[PDB]
Design a protein around this ligand. Structure first.
Ligand SMILES: CCOC(=O)C1=C2N=C(S[C@H](C(C)=O)C(=O)OCC)c3ccccc3N2NN1
Ligand SMILES: CCOC(=O)C1=C2N=C(S[C@H](C(C)=O)C(=O)OCC)c3ccccc3N2NN1
Ligand SMILES: [Ca+2]
Ligand SMILES: [Ca+2]
Ligand SMILES: [Ca+2]
Ligand SMILES: [Ca+2]
Lengths: 90, 90
């Protein structure tokens, strides 16, 4: 398995670790998204310490407006992060 | 660096390895895309052995219709692959 293939597997793996905690087990609710960002994105994103930031991030990622982050919305979140890191250093 | 962070870095790293080979060094031309798929996606995608498959894949990924795969189009390609693997096993 190449580095890219590992990256594909990691994306699926992390999303499921967090989404299967509570409620709908194929979607990230706000508390699951927060912990995902806090535990797994600590070198890229500011630790989230406030409800209003949790709320705004979910507002941003939630394209279909159902209150949670599904797998496709997670993939779009990853693309945002990846494009930002890319553009920082390019 | 967590597994997700590694995956973010790998995405940027692989795209640049391949895109900087020839011509526009921030885009994948057909030959660079083919080698990327052949070398780095061999467990997920069929080896590409034919010009018409190279052509069709590029046709598919090339949303802005400029003939090449830019970083955003690459990110969409990764999402396709990730969603397909996700749905296979779910
Ligand atoms: C946000 C408060 O804490 C920090 O900024 C720290 C931080 N931040 C980053 S980058 C990350 C980004 C790009 O938003 C970030 O959280 O900073 C906010 C501007 C980082 C990267 C590698 C190694 C250690 C790091 N680190 N240690 N404390
Ligand atoms: C395409 C011709 O060669 C193959 O199919 C091989 C193949 N294929 C896969 S999966 C991959 C997918 C899902 O499209 C694929 O190329 O198969 C086409 C149906 C694979 C995964 C793990 C380990 C070894 C593997 N492997 N060894 N020969
Ligand atoms: Ca959930
Ligand atoms: Ca949603
Ligand atoms: Ca190129
Ligand atoms: Ca294009």
């Amino acid at each position: 398995m190449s580095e890219l293939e590992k990256a594909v597997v990691a994306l699926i793996d992390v999303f499921h670790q967090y989404s299967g905690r509570e409620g709908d087990k194929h979607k990230l609710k706000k508390s699951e998204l927060k912990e995902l960002i806090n535990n797994e994105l600590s070198h890229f994103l500011e630790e989230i310490k406030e409800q209003e930031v949790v709320d705004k991030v979910m507002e941003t990622l939630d394209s279909d407006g159902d209150g949670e982050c599904d797998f496709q919305e997670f993939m779009a979140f990853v693309a945002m992060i990846t494009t930002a890191c890319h553009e920082f250093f390019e």
